[PDB]
């Protein structure tokens, strides 16, 4: 199971991908008040912690951060 996960992140990690800057964190709770799919997790169909980034187009995204390197680590 581990080798299979490990190869998929890497295919994601290779270019193309956007670069932006992190203006602020929020780190809000896991599982807000909802139930949908999968399992309660840091991010999934259920996402807790996120960091808001101001990208270079003058667009803003608040997105959930992968747990390989957490939003708390961000």
């Amino acid at each position: 199971k581990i080798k299979e996960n490990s190869e998929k992140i890497k295919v994601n990690k290779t270019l193309p991908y956007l670069v932006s800057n992190v203006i602020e964190l929020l780190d809000v709770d896991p599982n807000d008040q909802e139930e949908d799919g999968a399992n309660i997790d840091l991010d999934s169909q259920r996402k807790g912690k996120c960091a808001v980034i101001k990208t270079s187009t003058r667009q803003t995204y608040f997105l959930p951060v992968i747990g390989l390197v957490d939003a708390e680590k961000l």
Binding site: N21, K54, T55, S56, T57, R58
Partner: protein
């Protein structure tokens, strides 16, 4: 302690030299910086770059941050630039709010030079948020005599120049203008086959440096 010093008035007295001299005495790190100047390519990417610079300069205390051309950062006006300038502008106000204490006041010093005093942050003008704010008046009699003396040390001291006498002749020449004058005085001297700067040499240098030109309209000139 005093939170900092503000310099305003017509420049040319040596507002950059002054800042540099004080900072040298103290052996505090000297940032010559101006708010929106690190904006590279786009406004998005450039907002970040300029904000980061502002913060960086404040830190590494003790320090002296020298802000040049703060007319733009000041936003006395009802319009803003809304690019990188906004960010640097907000962080300054927050910073001044935080500074009142005994402890940050000494550590972080700020010195600023701007052309006017009415295009600085609306807060700065409210109260003395920096202790002792100095206006530089038009050149007094003592000022003139001194700007000549320091320059004669730089080149050479002739028996001919007399600072007291020189001050009377001329009116309204500041430090920068004066440096140009001493360089000019030297030009005259090189023509003569001299190294000495004569009293006549300093005088003549004064006329070339201004708007005035040889072969004047007037029939007494």
């Amino acid at each position: 302690p005093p939170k900092g010093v503000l310099m305003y008035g017509p420049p040319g007295t040596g507002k950059t030299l002054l800042a540099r001299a004080c900072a040298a005495q103290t052996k505090a790190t000297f940032l010559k910086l101006a708010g929106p100047q690190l904006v590279q390519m786009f406004i998005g990417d450039g907002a970040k770059l300029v904000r980061d610079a502002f913060a960086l300069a404040k830190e590494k205390a003790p320090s002296i941050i020298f802000i040049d051309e703060l007319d733009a950062i000041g936003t006395k006006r009802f319009d803003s630039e809304k690019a990188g300038d906004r960010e640097v502008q907000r962080t300054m106000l927050e910073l001044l709010n935080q500074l009142d204490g005994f402890q940050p006041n000494t550590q972080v010093k700020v010195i600023a030079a701007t052309n006017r005093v009415d295009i600085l942050d609306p807060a700065l003008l409210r109260s003395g948020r920096l202790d002792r704010k100095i206006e530089f008046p038009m050149p007094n009699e003592e000022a003139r005599a001194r700007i000549m003396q320091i320059h004669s040390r730089k080149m050479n001291v002739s028996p001919d120049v007399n600072y007291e006498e020189l001050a009377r002749c001329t009116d309204d020449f500041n430090g920068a203008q004066c440096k140009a004058v001493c360089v000019e005085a030297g030009m005259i001297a090189l023509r003569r086959g001299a190294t000495e700067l004569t009293h006549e040499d300093y005088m003549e240098g004064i006329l070339e440096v201004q708007a005035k030109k040889k072969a004047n309209l007037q029939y007494y000139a």
